[PDB]
Enzyme design. Structure first.
Site, PDB file in Angstrom:
ATOM      1  N   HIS B  85      20.062 -37.445  17.232  1.00  0.00           N
ATOM      2  CA  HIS B  85      20.135 -38.770  17.875  1.00  0.00           C
ATOM      3  C   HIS B  85      18.786 -39.420  18.102  1.00  0.00           C
ATOM      4  O   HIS B  85      18.667 -40.619  17.966  1.00  0.00           O
ATOM      5  CB  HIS B  85      20.943 -38.703  19.179  1.00  0.00           C
ATOM      6  CG  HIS B  85      22.404 -38.657  18.892  1.00  0.00           C
ATOM      7  ND1 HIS B  85      23.368 -39.155  19.731  1.00  0.00           N
ATOM      8  CD2 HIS B  85      23.067 -38.220  17.778  1.00  0.00           C
ATOM      9  CE1 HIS B  85      24.567 -38.938  19.204  1.00  0.00           C
ATOM     10  NE2 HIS B  85      24.411 -38.412  18.003  1.00  0.00           N
ATOM     11  N   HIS B 253      27.294 -30.301  11.539  1.00  0.00           N
ATOM     12  CA  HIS B 253      28.583 -29.829  12.058  1.00  0.00           C
ATOM     13  C   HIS B 253      28.936 -28.408  11.704  1.00  0.00           C
ATOM     14  O   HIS B 253      29.900 -27.834  12.260  1.00  0.00           O
ATOM     15  CB  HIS B 253      29.647 -30.837  11.654  1.00  0.00           C
ATOM     16  CG  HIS B 253      29.421 -32.186  12.264  1.00  0.00           C
ATOM     17  ND1 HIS B 253      30.092 -33.324  11.851  1.00  0.00           N
ATOM     18  CD2 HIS B 253      28.575 -32.580  13.227  1.00  0.00           C
ATOM     19  CE1 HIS B 253      29.683 -34.354  12.560  1.00  0.00           C
ATOM     20  NE2 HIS B 253      28.762 -33.934  13.413  1.00  0.00           N
TER      21      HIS B 253
HETATM   22  C1  HEM Z   1      27.937 -39.031   9.913  1.00  0.00           C
HETATM   23  C2  HEM Z   1      28.341 -39.417  11.113  1.00  0.00           C
HETATM   24  C3  HEM Z   1      28.368 -38.506  12.248  1.00  0.00           C
HETATM   25  C4  HEM Z   1      29.355 -38.597  13.164  1.00  0.00           C
HETATM   26  C5  HEM Z   1      30.391 -39.723  13.196  1.00  0.00           C
HETATM   27  C6  HEM Z   1      29.140 -37.569  14.097  1.00  0.00           C
HETATM   28  C7  HEM Z   1      29.965 -37.405  15.208  1.00  0.00           C
HETATM   29  C8  HEM Z   1      29.783 -36.440  16.166  1.00  0.00           C
HETATM   30  C9  HEM Z   1      30.568 -36.281  17.338  1.00  0.00           C
HETATM   31  C10 HEM Z   1      31.667 -37.165  17.718  1.00  0.00           C
HETATM   32  C11 HEM Z   1      30.138 -35.191  18.003  1.00  0.00           C
HETATM   33  C12 HEM Z   1      30.672 -34.637  19.282  1.00  0.00           C
HETATM   34  C13 HEM Z   1      29.751 -34.955  20.442  1.00  0.00           C
HETATM   35  C14 HEM Z   1      30.312 -34.304  21.693  1.00  0.00           C
HETATM   36  O1  HEM Z   1      31.452 -34.709  22.060  1.00  0.00           O
HETATM   37  O2  HEM Z   1      29.667 -33.393  22.369  1.00  0.00           O
HETATM   38  C15 HEM Z   1      29.063 -34.672  17.222  1.00  0.00           C
HETATM   39  C16 HEM Z   1      28.429 -33.510  17.554  1.00  0.00           C
HETATM   40  C17 HEM Z   1      27.386 -33.071  16.797  1.00  0.00           C
HETATM   41  N1  HEM Z   1      26.924 -33.654  15.644  1.00  0.00           N
HETATM   42 FE1  HEM Z   1      27.531 -35.174  14.679  1.00  0.00          FE
HETATM   43  N2  HEM Z   1      28.141 -36.808  13.681  1.00  0.00           N
HETATM   44  C18 HEM Z   1      27.584 -37.334  12.609  1.00  0.00           C
HETATM   45  C19 HEM Z   1      26.438 -36.928  11.943  1.00  0.00           C
HETATM   46  C20 HEM Z   1      25.638 -35.881  12.358  1.00  0.00           C
HETATM   47  C21 HEM Z   1      24.398 -35.445  11.766  1.00  0.00           C
HETATM   48  C22 HEM Z   1      23.736 -36.200  10.656  1.00  0.00           C
HETATM   49  C23 HEM Z   1      23.956 -34.371  12.464  1.00  0.00           C
HETATM   50  C24 HEM Z   1      22.817 -33.460  12.224  1.00  0.00           C
HETATM   51  C25 HEM Z   1      22.277 -33.263  11.036  1.00  0.00           C
HETATM   52  C26 HEM Z   1      24.991 -34.109  13.428  1.00  0.00           C
HETATM   53  C27 HEM Z   1      25.013 -33.058  14.278  1.00  0.00           C
HETATM   54  C28 HEM Z   1      25.867 -32.867  15.336  1.00  0.00           C
HETATM   55  C29 HEM Z   1      25.811 -31.668  16.224  1.00  0.00           C
HETATM   56  C30 HEM Z   1      24.923 -30.493  16.210  1.00  0.00           C
HETATM   57  C31 HEM Z   1      26.764 -31.798  17.159  1.00  0.00           C
HETATM   58  C32 HEM Z   1      27.150 -30.813  18.246  1.00  0.00           C
HETATM   59  C33 HEM Z   1      26.855 -31.032  19.685  1.00  0.00           C
HETATM   60  C34 HEM Z   1      27.117 -29.903  20.570  1.00  0.00           C
HETATM   61  O3  HEM Z   1      27.556 -28.814  20.153  1.00  0.00           O
HETATM   62  O4  HEM Z   1      26.846 -30.100  21.814  1.00  0.00           O
HETATM   63  N3  HEM Z   1      26.007 -35.017  13.287  1.00  0.00           N
HETATM   64  N4  HEM Z   1      28.951 -35.372  16.041  1.00  0.00           N
END
Ligand code: HEM
Ligand code: HEM
Ligand code: NIZ
Ligand code: NIZ
Ligand code: NIZ
Ligand code: NIZ
Ligand code: NIZ
Ligand code: NIZ
Ligand code: NA
Ligand code: NA
Ligand code: NA
Ligand code: NA
Ligand code: NA
Ligand code: NA
Ligand code: NA
Ligand code: NA
Lengths: 710, 710
Positions: B85, B253
């Site tokens: 972010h 993810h």
């Molecule tokens: C392409 C569009 C993307 C969408 C729509 C998206 C959406 C989300 C959403 C909805 C969450 C859940 C947040 C929560 O409720 O705690 C999340 C978590 C996360 N996303 Fe994404 N994501 C995207 C791209 C990315 C990218 C590019 C990265 C890293 C390279 C990433 C890494 C993460 C990680 C690590 C979490 C986990 C948070 C946790 O475990 O506390 N995402 N993502």
């Protein structure tokens, strides 16, 4: 499309409108100041050829320019109105406004409806500014213009001081009122009026975008007696009493005229709203002739005296000897005109003197006749015109200098040698004494660190950079009314002063110098107690002012009814404690990082009003450490609201209350800018930076009023 | 009541919302910077104990804190989301956003709905910041956290550079979009969408307060194929192509989860809206348990992989091998869940591993399966996981470094030795040559002052401090695509380059060094022509970049389609010319006084695009004087609009047209701050200050990209 936040509306301001406006603390900084870092206006203005300037300015009065011709060939009335409006924004409650910064050339003031066509007056002074350059600020020039106008029109002015340094952007700290329209009636939503038409407190004008009152009557309804009440109120909030108020009004309108010979709807936008082709000017009439006899400014039309280009006794002669009735000017404004004037009293047309025009009085002028208290002063001035000219000259000087601060800041050959009481005079203090000897006596007293520091803080904290009143110079804390102010803790204060007066007597250092030296000693001890040895910088020379030279009533506005730095609030107020701290901090001239270290340090020194422990997040009170920040930033605690302006700092694991705290304490851990600063000072590596920054901020505050130094 | 403009809403901004936002030029100044004036973060960060830091940060990953417990005992997913972010606000059109300043700790970004609970992640890193202190910026720390998380969870990251200096307030220059609500649908008034769902141009997110796209679908309506289009668009605007986009999504993810096990309505205000007791945190649930298994963040609930604490091939295994359908999380969000998963693939409860919970995919995840182009990359990554891990590691490095500028700014032991094309590599230039000799050859050419100055300006003007791309280092002006840009006047440019390439060949100074030296020579001559002798400061060492190391398509965003400084506009745009000048000036790092002198000087040097005379208010073009200001401030002229971006400067007495001018010229005489600056430079006494300030601003711009210097 481009990604720049390139117009003023795009902002964080819209999203969280309640956030502290920390920008007011980072104004007038290097990136806006176009002068070299070693430029010093005071030393330049000392080199100005004042006699030559006086000559040019006098010549300008009768050097009509064709794009805004001088009425009757004389710009004097315009120039006095310019200078009166510049000075006329001052108010006593916070010292903000006044002519002391040249603010009329910037928004919002350059575009207030009451400042209509003063854009032309400022522009007319440009060739002089261009000529004298860096040795003549626009601020001094604007303040001087009307003084020279009076001289040229036959009045003996009382004097003039240079020394006003220019600024380069609007004064963001000045709250001008709650309205979001220009000149709305006092029953609008967002009114500046409460209760029984009581004008809300910092404000000194009856509505948004006026200097004092409405010339057509209260909310635009003529009634001299209600107009008088507003006049009396607004002028008192600008430091003027009945006599000064009548003198100023009559003296202003002895010259010049009201312009309202056309249709006001045809004037183009005010300057901040006008487009680039208007040359930073406004109110331009592009539909018809908007100049000379066709000028429209206030919308009223006429002159108060038969001979508006000269100082005379025309004003009371007209007002008191004619009877008056209400009429409408050509622009549609209410005004008073005389019943049956003689031809020979009619002021002539501003372009062609073979044509006669009309006399006029505003509702405020009629107030001077109908209000019973003004009427008496008016008759005195009509029967004793020498007295009138004297009082007027003095009040005009006060008007234009009341925000200049101590006489030590005044420069130039026409500075009056009299000490006027509103300059809060202070004598020079003896500088030839042994500082160390004084320190040793202070240390050998049994006064605590907290007594010492609190007392020096309380002496200095009254300083305000808005009008350069207050501060530690003069030791007015030992006099009425300060010595009995509740925030000053009069018993503790009497106790410390008894000692320090003894020391001053014994050493020939002023009580003022000793009060400050003593706070330095308390800080020094506190640092020593942390194993840090420093000597604080110190400048001797403060004088002790007398009761005779201390206007008791005028000091009322400096009373500390709130001071976050000692966790003090006299009552419960509508503004948040942290907003009040920001205000005070801005008047002290402090930056946000300064504000921050001062809080943290004062807290651990044990200086809170009433010996409260709120925010005292240390096990070693009296010792100058960064404990406040360490603990404030520690997530082993949670913060629980616990009533008004109070919180419990509780251990998350034991659920026990470890400390208490106010909003003033906790904002430094909540606001995202302030906590960033708090975190910097809570770093393992910044114990010494913390002490050093504390010290530098302390010193800044102790020296804020030392204009006597070079 | 108090007279302080003490909350952010009180302002000049309300009255004239169209005014230029000149404050964006006076950011990050001394009064906000709490560090000493000699503090240099680059030299401090060189002394940081990186191995010790790596150790502490790795330990933090499994050091759960009870006020925000780590999922499964591992903060890795949270920390990667934090760093993603932080970096994910970058956009290519202006270079603004990204992780390069630590902006996530300030408004507005700290309180964006997409940054929910990243307040806890930042807070969890505080003990490390406290420990390493001034040698570790929050910016570097935040950028590093997710890299170390990946290492600890089993991924071989590609490297890391320190060197991001902290800031102390929001970046006021960044326009985040037109909306006045969080996450409104694309049919709202104030939409960022035009035409056929075309996303307005600087913006790189689909709505206000999201990083890229909506995880629930376009406007909250699930449809993987429409989600794919938005993903492709937003990620391209953040410099990522299909392969990098699929890699990033899947790689992110592979770890962590979505939190939505409760009611989102019970979360307290975001941080800038929360009161003091929340410790600068937000979204706090005070009504029920808001932590651990009861956390609510996005509102979706589940993990993408069976083993969310480790790097594996779980992501494509789940996505590609299960079939998926739409379900609602407990918080009410749309999400995809697998049809008939096996028990053994269910991720376990974050507090108790003996309980099984659920798998999930977002609409963006499903896009990676349904969009035909992504589907192919996804199958490649599933069949070739070593390739996946490589591409992902590289893209993650790019993500987190794409706004760091040239490699000369990178510091630390894990900097990759490879030159990646997106770092716009430039070699070191020879510094051992005779400068004077080069100057003499330049002077002896028959190239005019205007050719010389325009060419050096055009070489440097591409610099932008938002991502530290562009500038004169590298002489990329001589290469595609710059050499054929219309604003660069390719014929004149080819003519000058032919000469200066000859000089560089002959002397062993780079073409880059010679381009700059030549502009210095043109300035020098122009000053000499006014009887002023100066030598401009000059730093040799620029390299000449190659075509091979110049990504042609990525340079498109640096094309000068507007440049007020040479009175250039490629087309008629909706933004005003002066707003465009302000934007460019902010990216160059210039202050308003700098902007002002540069305009005036460039104008009289005769450097306008197309050899136009607009704003050339001199009878001696080629001579470096303050004529622009003298004439601009002269009220013998009136200004008449004369079509698009054009005005006639007419003699008031003869009604003849003396000069013409654009809005870029005339704003310096119209805006009340800029005219105050113009007037300063038009003073009789400031001819030499004008030259000196011009020179200093010129030099600043020529050296803006010289990170290779110490
Ligand atoms: C392409 C569009 C993307 C969408 C729509 C998206 C959406 C989300 C959403 C909805 C969450 C859940 C947040 C929560 O409720 O705690 C999340 C978590 C996360 N996303 Fe994404 N994501 C995207 C791209 C990315 C990218 C590019 C990265 C890293 C390279 C990433 C890494 C993460 C990680 C690590 C979490 C986990 C948070 C946790 O475990 O506390 N995402 N993502
Ligand atoms: C007490 C409340 C006051 C009211 C309501 C008031 C009202 C006005 C109005 C309506 C005008 C006409 C402006 C125009 O249309 O051009 C004006 C002009 C002027 N006033 Fe006042 N005034 C007040 C106090 C003062 C004071 C205190 C001074 C100076 C000591 C002053 C000096 C002037 C002068 C010189 C002009 C003439 C402008 C010219 O000839 O261009 N007034 N006043
Ligand atoms: N054209 N100007 C007039 O007739 C006039 C001037 C001043 N008061 C009333 C009327
Ligand atoms: N209403 N007319 C003016 O304000 C004006 C006239 C001529 N030049 C500048 C301004
Ligand atoms: N409502 N009154 C005004 O707008 C006004 C007052 C004084 N000068 C110009 C305009
Ligand atoms: N109390 N928590 C649950 O029952 C739950 C957790 C995660 N997804 C669905 C339900
Ligand atoms: N929703 N709960 C929280 O965000 C929180 C819990 C405990 N301490 C600080 C914050
Ligand atoms: N409409 N979507 C949201 O408000 C949201 C999105 C992602 N995280 C938290 C909230
Ligand atoms: Na400066
Ligand atoms: Na003031
Ligand atoms: Na008179
Ligand atoms: Na330090
Ligand atoms: Na500073
Ligand atoms: Na950036
Ligand atoms: Na995994
Ligand atoms: Na000078």
């Amino acid at each position: 499309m481009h990604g720049g936040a390139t117009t003023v509306n795009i902002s964080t301001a819209e999203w969280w409108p309640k956030a502290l406006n920390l920008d007011i603390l980072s104004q007038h900084d290097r990136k806006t100041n176009p002068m070299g870092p070693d430029f010093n206006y005071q030393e330049e203005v000392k080199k100005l050829d004042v006699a030559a300037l006086k000559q040019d300015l006098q010549a300008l009065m009768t050097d009509s320019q064709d794009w805004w011709p001088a009425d009757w060939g004389h710009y004097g009335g315009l120039m006095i109105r310019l200078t009166w409006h510049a000075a006329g924004t001052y108010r006593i409650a916070d010292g903000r406004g006044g002519a002391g910064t040249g603010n009329q050339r910037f928004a919002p003031l350059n575009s207030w409806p009451d400042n209509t066509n003063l854009d032309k007056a400022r522009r007319l002074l440009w060739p002089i500014k261009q000529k004298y350059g860096n040795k003549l600020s626009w601020a001094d020039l604007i303040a001087y213009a009307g003084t020279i106008a009076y001289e040229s029109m036959g009045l003996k002015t009382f004097g003039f001081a240079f020394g006003r340094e220019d600024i380069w952007h609007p004064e963001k700290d000045i709250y001008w009122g709650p309205e979001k329209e220009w000149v709305p009636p006092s029953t609008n939503p967002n009114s500046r009026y409460t209760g029984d038409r009581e004008l809300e407190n910092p404000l000194a004008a009856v509505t948004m975008g006026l200097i004092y009152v409405n010339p057509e009557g209260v909310d635009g309804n003529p009634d001299p007696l209600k107009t008088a009440h507003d006049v009396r109120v607004t002028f008192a909030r600008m430091a003027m009493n009945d006599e000064e108020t009548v003198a100023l009004t009559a003296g202003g309108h002895t010259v010049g005229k009201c312009h309202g010979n056309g249709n006001a709807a045809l004037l183009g936008p005010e300057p901040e709203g006008a487009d680039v082709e208007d040359q930073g000017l406004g109110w331009i009439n592009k539909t018809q002739s908007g100049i000379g006899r066709n000028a429209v400014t206030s919308g009223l039309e006429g002159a108060w005296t038969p001979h508006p280009t000269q100082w005379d006794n025309g004003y009371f002669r007209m007002l008191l000897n004619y009877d008056w009735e209400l009429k409408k000017s050509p622009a549609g404004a209410w005004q008073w005109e005389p019943i049956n004037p003689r031809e020979e009293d009619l002021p002539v047309d501003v372009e062609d003197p073979s044509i006669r025009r009309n006399l006029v009085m505003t509702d405020a002028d009629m107030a001077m006749k109908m209000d019973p208290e003004y009427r008496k002063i008016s008759e005195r001035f009509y029967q004793d015109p020498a007295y009138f000219a004297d009082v007027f000259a003095r009040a005009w000087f006060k008007l234009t200098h009341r925000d200049m601060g101590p006489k030590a800041r005044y420069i130039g050959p026409d500075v009056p040698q009299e000490d006027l009481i509103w300059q809060d005079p202070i004598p020079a203090g003896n500088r030839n004494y042994d500082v160390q000897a004084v320190k040793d006596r202070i240390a050998a007293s049994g006064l605590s660190i907290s007594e010492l520091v609190s007392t020096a803080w309380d002496s200095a904290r009254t300083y305000r950079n808005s009008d350069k009143r207050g501060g530690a110079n003069g030791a007015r804390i030992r006099l009425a009314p300060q010595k009995d102010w509740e925030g000053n803790e009069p018993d503790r204060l009497a106790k410390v002063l008894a000692v320090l007066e003894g020391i001053a007597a014994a050493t020939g250092a002023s009580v003022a110098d000793v009060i400050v030296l003593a706070g330095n000693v308390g800080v020094e001890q506190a640092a020593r107690a942390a194993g840090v040895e420093i000597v604080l910088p110190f400048a001797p020379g403060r004088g002790d002012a007398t009761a005779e030279q201390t206007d008791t009533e005028s000091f009322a506005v400096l009373e500390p009814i709130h001071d976050g730095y000692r966790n003090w609030l006299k009552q419960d107020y509508a503004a948040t404690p942290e907003e009040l701290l920001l205000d005070r901090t801005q008047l002290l001239g402090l930056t946000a990082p300064e504000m921050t270290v001062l809080i943290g340090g004062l807290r651990v020194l044990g200086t809170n009003h009433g010996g409260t422990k709120h925010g005292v997040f240390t096990d070693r009170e009296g010792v100058l450490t960064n404990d406040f920040f360490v603990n404030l930033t520690d997530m082993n605690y949670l913060w629980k609201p616990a009533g008004k302006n109070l919180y419990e700092i509780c251990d998350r694991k034991t659920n026990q209350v470890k400390w208490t705290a106010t909003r003033v304490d906790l904002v430094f851990g909540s606001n995202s800018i302030l906590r960033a600063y708090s975190e910097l000072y809570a770093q393992d590596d910044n114990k010494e930076k913390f002490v050093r920054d504390f010290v530098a901020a302390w010193t800044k505050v102790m020296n804020a009023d030392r204009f006597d130094l070079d």
